[PDB]
Design a binder for this molecule. Structure first.
Ligand SMILES: C[C@H](CS(C)(=O)=O)Nc1ncc2cc(Oc3ccc(F)cc3F)c(=O)n(C)c2n1
Length: 343
């Protein structure tokens, strides 16, 4: 049955959460840290802003809830709890999500400086293990980056924000665009799962060197940095770019050959370099997958084929379905009500 709910103003809104959650303190984007007296765990509790203000919001709310309920994996943010203080569907208008409070994002550990090769192995291994599970369910993260990768004190890693930016926040000299596969940055085509492997490659590079790999001052500048490294596209890839405007623009660019990665990442483990060359491939059909990357020699100390699970089938037929706000709300309510907390 329904626990007692208390109220509290925190992020300029009043948070009505069950009594078990105490010592709520804001931590950013809205999310609060709290202590779960019921489990003894420190938790992150997320309140969604106007979940059913439009069709899009209602759908996105349902999407998020659906994604987090499905995901059960060490390297993927999992749901400890979801609640609403509403007793009926008629009163339903607030959704709260609960997970582990994580110590630090990847940005905070990197801190301009380099990391040891063993550290980089463990961290990239965990992202890839997470990604393989996510991808096995035909879910793409689409926005992998250091601030989306959260870590504990033993350097155990979870992926956040999978499967879920405006026009201006993607503009200029911003970490929001630096990890984006050029196909999706420039809308070249219907994009596949390997957009995420491009992001891993960006992240891995930064971990080895302590520096951003493609720190573009804008979309076009970032593209130039990318083609400098990996070379301009050949005939086969140009055909695959569906946007004619985009195809025509690349075809304006002076041809450049792929660089020597050994000479770019001086001093780095040659297995790292090799792996990097397979991730940072312009044509997305030819990029290495998370499954294949996990069997690469670079991870020989961590790789265990029987300890790298795939996800249960994910039904996302809802994605191409047009419902009314009320209908999205009703679906979301059923998912809240039916949730079963993990052991
Ligand atoms: C990396 C931060 C460091 S700290 C303690 O300084 O804030 N730790 C952390 N730990 C957990 C989260 C969880 C989130 O979103 C959630 C995602 C799912 C959920 F069920 C609940 C959530 F709060 C979410 O956006 N962020 C930014 C989180 N951040």
């Amino acid at each position: 049955e329904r626990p007692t709910f208390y109220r509290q103003e925190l992020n300029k809104t009043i948070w009505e959460v069950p009594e078990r959650y105490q010592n709520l303190s804001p931590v950013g984007s809205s999310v609060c840290a709290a202590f779960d007296t019921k489990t003894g765990l420190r938790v992150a509790v997320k309140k969604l802003s106007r979940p059913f203000q439009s069709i899009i919001h209602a759908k996105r709310t349902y999407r998020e809830l659906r994604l987090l309920k499905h995901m059960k994996h060490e390297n993927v943010i999992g749901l400890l709890d979801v609640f609403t203080p509403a007793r009926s569907l008629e009163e339903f208008n607030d959704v709260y999500l609960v997970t582990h409070l994580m110590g630090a994002d990847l940005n905070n550990i990197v801190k301009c400086q380099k990391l040891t090769d063993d550290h980089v192995q463990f961290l990239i291994y965990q992202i890839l293990r997470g990604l393989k599970y996510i991808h096995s369910a035909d879910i793409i993260h689409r926005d992998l980056k250091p601030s989306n990768l959260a870590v504990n004190e033993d350097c155990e890693l979870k992926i956040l924000d999978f499967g879920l930016h405006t026009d201006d926040e993607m503009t200029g000299y911003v970490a929001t665009r630096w990890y984006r596969a050029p196909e999706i940055m420039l809308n070249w085509m219907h994009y596949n799962q390997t957009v995420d492997i491009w992001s891993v490659g960006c992240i891995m590079a930064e971990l080895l060197t302590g520096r951003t790999l493609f720190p573009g001052t804008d979309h076009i500048d970032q593209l130039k940095l990318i083609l400098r490294l990996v070379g301009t596209p050949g005939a086969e890839l140009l055909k695959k770019i569906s946007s004619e405007s985009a195809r025509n623009y690349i075809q304006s660019l002076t041809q450049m050959p792929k660089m020597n990665f050994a000479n770019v990442f001086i001093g780095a483990n040659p297995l790292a370099v090799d792996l990097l060359e397979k991730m940072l491939v312009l044509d997305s059909d030819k990029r290495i997958t998370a499954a294949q990357a996990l069997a690469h020699a670079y991870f020989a100390q961590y790789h265990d084929p029987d300890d790298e699970p795939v996800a249960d089938p994910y039904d996302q037929s809802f994605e191409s379905r047009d419902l009314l706000i009320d209908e999205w709300k009703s679906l979301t309510y059923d998912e809240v009500i039916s949730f079963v907390p993990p052991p």
